[PDB]
């Protein structure tokens, strides 16, 4: 159970984004239904009144939290991968529009899942803004908690992969549009019960054998990292 507080740009806090530039749901409950419109931008998908200005080559940092800012971030049990997608705002996230900018699942060296490193980073993970057409965008940050993903939600609705999904309204101002955004995948639709990484047993299968759900990260991406860029406690 986790939510996005706001974003940083180039290590500068853009301020509390909840229901402002983040299309925030009312609480930190997971989405589990792979076919639900809730897979796009969670359960209260609507235009919020601000969009964060960035330029191509900027570092955009999502900051997650559990109950209060810079707390335990997400329960340690919620081992799983982290992805970031982008689509143009005109889509409202509908159709084949979502392009993957970032993927992190399991790090064999440190023996840590993306989620484990997200807690250590005080909820912060980043992408570098790509050289797409200037205009308005949705950045969709997605945590998949796998602690009940040995079951499929479609078969047993009290278990399944847990999706923590947050859409940020981002406006790209300065960009040469030298890496125009290629075709996207749909959410809902890209993840199905047979998709690699949706049904997995983290208790019996080695984490080194985990494969995250496609699509692969776009070659145009510059992303990006799970790492603290700013200290929330200084504000
Ligand atoms: C999952 O979402 C689909 C599409 O909205 C819906 O028809 C179905 O009833 C949902 N399943 C549950 C258990 O709510
Ligand atoms: Cu939870």
Swiss-Prot record:
Main location: secreted
List of glycosylated residues: 33, 110
Catalysed reactions listed for this entry: [(1->4)-beta-D-glucosyl]n+m + reduced acceptor + O2 = 4-dehydro-beta-D-glucosyl-[(1->4)-beta-D-glucosyl]n-1 + [(1->4)-beta-D-glucosyl]m + acceptor + H2O
Residue(s) carrying Methylhistidine: 1
Localisation: Secreted
GO cellular component: extracellular region
Cofactor(s) annotated in UniProt: Cu(2+)
GO molecular function: metal ion binding; monooxygenase activity
Biotechnology: Lignocellulose is the most abundant polymeric composite on Earth and is a recalcitrant but promising renewable substrate for industrial biotechnology applications. Together with cellobiose dehydrogenases (CDHs) an enzymatic system capable of oxidative cellulose cleavage is formed, which increases the efficiency of cellulases and put LPMOs at focus of biofuel research.
Cofactor note: Binds 1 copper ion per subunit.
Membrane-crossing segments per the record: none
Binding-site positions, Cu(2+): 1, 78, 164
A GO biological process held by the record: cellulose catabolic process
Top-level taxon in the UniProt lineage: Eukaryota
Regulation of catalytic or functional activity: The polyphenol cinnamtannin B1 contained in methanolic extract of Cinnamomum cassia (cinnamon) acts as an inhibitor of catalytic activity.
Binding site for (1,4-beta-D-glucosyl)n: 9, 47-48, 58, 67, 129, 140
Disulfide-bonded cysteines: 41-167
Pfam families recorded: AA9
Post-translational modification: The catalytically essential N-terminal histidine His-1 is post-translationally modified by methylation to prevent protonation of the histidine side chain, and protect the critical active site of the enzyme from oxidative damage.
PANTHER family per UniProt: ENDO-BETA-1,4-GLUCANASE D (PTHR33353:SF17), PUTATIVE (AFU_ORTHOLOGUE AFUA_1G12560)-RELATED (PTHR33353)
Name of this protein: AA9 family lytic polysaccharide monooxygenase A
Recorded name of the encoding gene: LPMO9A
